[PDB]
Design a protein around this ligand. Sequence first.
Ligand SMILES: *[C@@H]1O[C@H](CO)[C@@H](O)[C@H](O)[C@H]1NC(C)=O
Ligand SMILES: O=C1O[C@H]([C@@H](O)CO)C(O)=C1O
Length: 246
Amino acid sequence: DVSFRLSGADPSSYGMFIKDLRNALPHTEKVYNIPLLLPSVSGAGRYLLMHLFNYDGNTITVAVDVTNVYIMGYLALTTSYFFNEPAADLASQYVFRSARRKITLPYSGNYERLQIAAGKPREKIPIGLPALDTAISTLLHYDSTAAAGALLVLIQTTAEAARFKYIEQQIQERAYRDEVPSSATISLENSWSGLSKQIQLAQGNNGVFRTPTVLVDSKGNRVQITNVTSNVVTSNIQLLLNTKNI
Ligand SMILES: *[C@@H]1O[C@H](CO)[C@@H](O)[C@H](O)[C@H]1NC(C)=O
Ligand SMILES: O=C1O[C@H]([C@@H](O)CO)C(O)=C1O
């Protein structure tokens, strides 16, 4: 399991948590020195438990699929909550089995469905460590509209930061003040699968991408990523989605 405590959190301790989250995910190989997540994992071992505590020290446990860093659901006190999707249904066979009841959220976990539920695109939802405190607090007691927003914050501050050092850094800058995510953040989030695939295909193409990946950079400019010498690959991305799962 991994844990994170908002009380006393600072950029350094958040960065530590994110490192621990990345290190909790298994891989047998690296591709251009980036850990390649497994194609598949059998049974219960497929799910990592991330214990999160708000500033007041109340906690939720979040279940994360170690093959794709997707959040399946979470436990708040004696009640479990899972997305309305086959993968999370499965997860519910293995995790939080002693919850007194299980709620299926009225939406799947994809960004587009969460945004609709939350009533706003994530461009307009501030993120940061205080937003994460708020999100944990929201999730402690069921409210599906509010939870959609809290889940968007939760996903981006945990899984997306684990995937991209740049997003980790964004959150670090938002340690004590939330701000909407930069376009670059959105762009990386949206491109993780595509980036992951091209990086894997580049191996056999001398580090060159079969299809270039268009992103938004730190300056708010469009950039075209063609090969593994880009900073996106050498410095930013930290985990690759197996092409088996694309
Ligand atoms: C690879 O990427 C670098 C960094 O963007 C760029 O300057 C260079 O032209 C590209 N090289 C090839 C072989 O495509
Ligand atoms: O395809 C997606 O996977 C994650 C989701 O599973 C939650 O982690 C996400 O946000 C998407 O849009």
